[model samples]
Target: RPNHTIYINNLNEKIKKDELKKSLHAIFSRFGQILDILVSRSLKMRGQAFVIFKEVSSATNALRSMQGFPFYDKPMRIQYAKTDSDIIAKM
Candidate 1:
């Protein structure tokens, strides 16, 4: 079993960071109680994001159901995050 986070990439980097995070929160919130939707604008992490949920089941459902779902004109690439966050090393 994986953690309550789904790592996502292949997002639309052209979108403003504010709009990107805003849209992401609304869209993924459809799956469950998303604790946070992290989308970075850094050149090294552009188009990459992570959605932290309250439960692994929600993360699982999201990863499976939306694996290739399109967003911002590109299909999303999702996977089980090997790392949760900087301070967490439960993986």
Candidate 2:
């Protein structure tokens, strides 16, 4: 199944959460309109984020283009989020 939300990792954990979200949105927004951007700074979820886009195609576009782009001295990986982000849309 295709999803509009993406799970990204490999971010620089040293970066502040505000900038983390900003950078992610700055890059991801180029692909399309984003619905939500969430980055958790907890140790368990450090350097991880989930971004929801307005369209599925936009999500795919962002994934391909930003898949390995270096940000904050690290290459980020993008993938379609599974059930983990289901609550985001459900709520």
Candidate 3:
């Protein structure tokens, strides 16, 4: 589906929520769409957030461009969220 969802995790303290969102927005802007972005910060921790993309294709493109790419001197880790079956199969 063109409207596919993507997840990004393991954010570090160096990347703030707004900054992360802006960076992602810039990346996805090429596709001419910015869906919803969800961020979660642990009270006990700093520099952590979850980003969700509205379309899978956008997510895939974002991952392709952003993953392992340096932002603020820190590299972002990106990938498709695997299902339970995917994990089980890997195991």
Candidate 4:
């Protein structure tokens, strides 16, 4: 089982939920199988998301390739998720 997940920040708050899902799917799906996607809409947590991939290599590739990728007019910040188990539980 691939346990790699990524944390993404610096998204555009105005982007709709469905839109964000579709957009993220389009970009991240290219690297590997996406197991889950979680986007936060709370005022303090807006524009942040977690993406879980089915493979560690895919997550690594996405982090490297999309670190500065522009989305909704803002650059995306991607990195390996720090609290892996905690975040997964919340999802």
Q: How high is the CA lDDT of each candidate model?
A: 0.80, 0.81, 0.54, 0.81
Candidate 2 local lDDT, 1-91, one digit each (tens): 5688888888788898887888888888989998888776572146788889878899889988899889889998888888435644665
Q: What are the per-residue Cα lDDT tens digits for candidate 3 across 5-39?
A: 44555455656666677766676567535445555
Which window of ten consecutive residues has the lowest lDDT sum in model 2?
82-91
Shift of residue 41 alpha carbon in model 3, Å: 2.1
Off by over 4 Å in 3: 1-3, 43-48, 82-91
- TM-score of each model, paired residue for residue: 0.84, 0.86, 0.59, 0.83
Clashes of 1: 0
Tens digits of per-residue lDDT for model 1, 1-91: 3888888888877888888888878888878888777765572146888888877788898998998888988899999888765423332
RMSD vs true structure, all candidates: 3.0, 2.2, 7.2, 3.5
Backbone clash count for every predicted candidate, in the order shown? 0, 0, 3, 0
Off by over 4 Å in 1: 43-45, 86-91
Clash pairs for candidate 4: none
Candidate 4 runs further than 4 Å off: 1-3, 43-45, 85-91
Q: Tens digits of per-residue lDDT for model 4 on 13-81?
A: 888877888889889999999888887566214788888887789999999899989898999998788
Worst 10 residues of 1 by lDDT: 82-91
